[PDB]
Amino acid sequence: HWGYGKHNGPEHWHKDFPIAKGERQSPVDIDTHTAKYDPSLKPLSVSYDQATSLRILNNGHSFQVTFDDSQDKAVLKGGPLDGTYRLLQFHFHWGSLDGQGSEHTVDKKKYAAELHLVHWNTKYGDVGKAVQQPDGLAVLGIFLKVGSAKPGLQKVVDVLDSIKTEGKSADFTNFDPRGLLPESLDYWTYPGSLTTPPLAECVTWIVLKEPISVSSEQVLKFRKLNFNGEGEPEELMVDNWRPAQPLKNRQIKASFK
Template identity: 60%
Template sequence: MSHSWGYEATNGPSKWGASFPIANGDRQSPIDIVPGNASHDPGLKPLKLKYDPSTCLEILNNGHSFQVTFADDTDSSTLTDGPISGTYRLKQFHFHWGATDDRGSEHTVQGAKFPAELHLVHWNTKYASFGEAVNKPDGLAVVGVFLKIGNENAHLQKLIDKFSVITNAKTQTTFVDFNPATLLPGCLDYWTYLGSLTTPPLYESVTWIVLKHQITVSSAQMAKFRTLLFSSNGEAPCCMENNYRPPQPLKGRVVRASFK
């Protein structure tokens, strides 16, 4: 495979610092969230997530994960309030997962991993575009949702049903009228901290909003995630799994909680 970075021994997270020195910066993500050390902040507002299914455009395999992209030229799908000020537009969502059901999330809670983690990526509309916002200290806000093994998730299944079309890297297909709000738990209590992208270029531009409560996924559905490939058509097949970065040092940052 020709990717300059990835999740193999030769190009995985332990090697990223060679090409992206910010990997050793002061606000890198993910982190291990220790609930007992998180500070309850009564000033944190409830999250306001407004998603319009008509802004959903396509689903793709980018060689690192699968991603669903959205039209972000209007304020139809936005995140407001919570720990942020202003309006952030939804750009895309993607997942990270492991080779087995007992690992796969990027963030951990008291050292515990979940099978997978969903990231909903939003950009600050005080900037002209996602491209302009992506490297600014307040440029992005990402909502993280943990997946836990349980009942089959009918909403996730709508994504999984498209996997046969996007099995190989650099493949995509139209994917419309999907509401990402269906991938959120009923309670939106959250932890928040200042961090970074968890993939290169690792910009320290993310206000992280990690939800306390999880959504379910069945073991059979998680197995389907692992049928996707890091490799492109014509390359030796390489299963897409363990596409997560380990927790990074907190380096004095404060994790705040919206709940007691």
């Protein structure tokens, strides 16, 4: 029922999901002058060499690439995290225009899109159990700006015409998510939530400072996806982002000076 329209969008979600007005909701604005460097943040470890991608799918809200998480293969460790977090899926949020689309903002700046690499804490055994825990998930968020093409994104963009509508999926094996990462792993971190229903307060957010550049042609392909299913009225999948939520009693910590 929920979505991103006038009558079912983020301002309505609290009726079915009262945690929408909770104490650790995401996304947030990252005020760069107020975020404090934390020298105790240990090294961040993105180990994606053995990643096994499986499928790409349009779920009616975004598109996602799924991974085999039945073994420690592609894992996130270090930084603010205790333990090992397995990569389950990545997806994006994007805008109808280049000046909006990201969920997190940086000094109120919106990027054209935001990539979320979603990982879950193996101490909880499965992702469903992890989402019930305050430290169950770790999401690596990466901003996209429009400029030069990202070569490591093109394989994704070229298959989107095959998953145009909600419920479509395709094989998407042998995709290397290392090709979506910027050079620097400098990051901000804070405790937050899923940015879609159920809005569970289970996420350690790790937002990279360095955006990746994608081309206008790449993002235009995102914008031709559909929220609707096949054989229904076409509503373009654009502006599938939740706006910044109140920071409340939280501090955003920086890994860098």
